[PDB]
Amino acid sequence: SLNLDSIIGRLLEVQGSRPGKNVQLTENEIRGLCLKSREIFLSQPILLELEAPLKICGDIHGQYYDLLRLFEYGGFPPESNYLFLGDYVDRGKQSLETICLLLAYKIKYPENFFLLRGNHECASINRIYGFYDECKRRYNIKLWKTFTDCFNCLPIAAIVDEKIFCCHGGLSPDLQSMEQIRRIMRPTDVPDQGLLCDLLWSDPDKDVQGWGENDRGVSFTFGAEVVAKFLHKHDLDLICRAHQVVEDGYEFFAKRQLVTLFSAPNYCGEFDNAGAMMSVDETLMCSFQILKPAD
């Protein structure tokens, strides 16, 4: 009983409209988006095994019109396949339009559109950084808890053609076998520590040898050698993650063995950074499409 095409059409119609018009779906349409996408998250693996070609995107943080630009330039679904690395809500002005369009595309193209969990897809975080206030202002508290129950079922990591490992944060000192990821039961909250936490919170640091304490107060940092030994132990070529703003939208680490993606340009009007999107073709040749305001 979900009119998915009508939802998507109303979401896409505000393209090219100055100023930033809202798309106010109905409470029941958003609840349908949450419950139908939730079923698809649980029926698909928590550790997604994907095949090229696809485009991989970093943080959005409710910058909805930047999300529309990513689709305009990368190809609206299903002209292209997509994997998002989390942090869809908070800080931005239009988290609701952002997550609703993403959940809608997830339902419409369930095996060509994929969404991973970021550390902001967590009730104890997005209660504070904006999403809850947006849900309360434009809808009600009950809908926010409906989103939380949906977010608690998002997949955690993806591996593209057995060579590109993808997650929001980074590596974990408690990650020896990929089976440890596949064993995490959903739905679940994000714990304050451990493998699931580290996958959504940790960062690479060029100045640490091995594992170090993260300035965020949560999880750890890892160095260039941790990345090399991880790639060698699991026969991987590249680690693709987000979770950190980078001025050119993408940023390599440890001799192109890890890349950080950030897809929200001019991050909430506080940075003059670009937004990037990594295209990988069927031969796993990876390039970057960069989105930047003209100057």
Partner: peptide, 26 residues
């Protein structure tokens, strides 16, 4: 036409063709 699974190698193009730019009016 799905891509969800139930020997390739990562490569990068010549440095000239690594980035593709899209500029928009803010």
């Amino acid at each position: 036409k799905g891509i969800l699974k139930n020997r390739k190698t990562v490569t990068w193009p010549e440095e000239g063709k690594l980035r593709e730019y899209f500029y928009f009016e803010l």
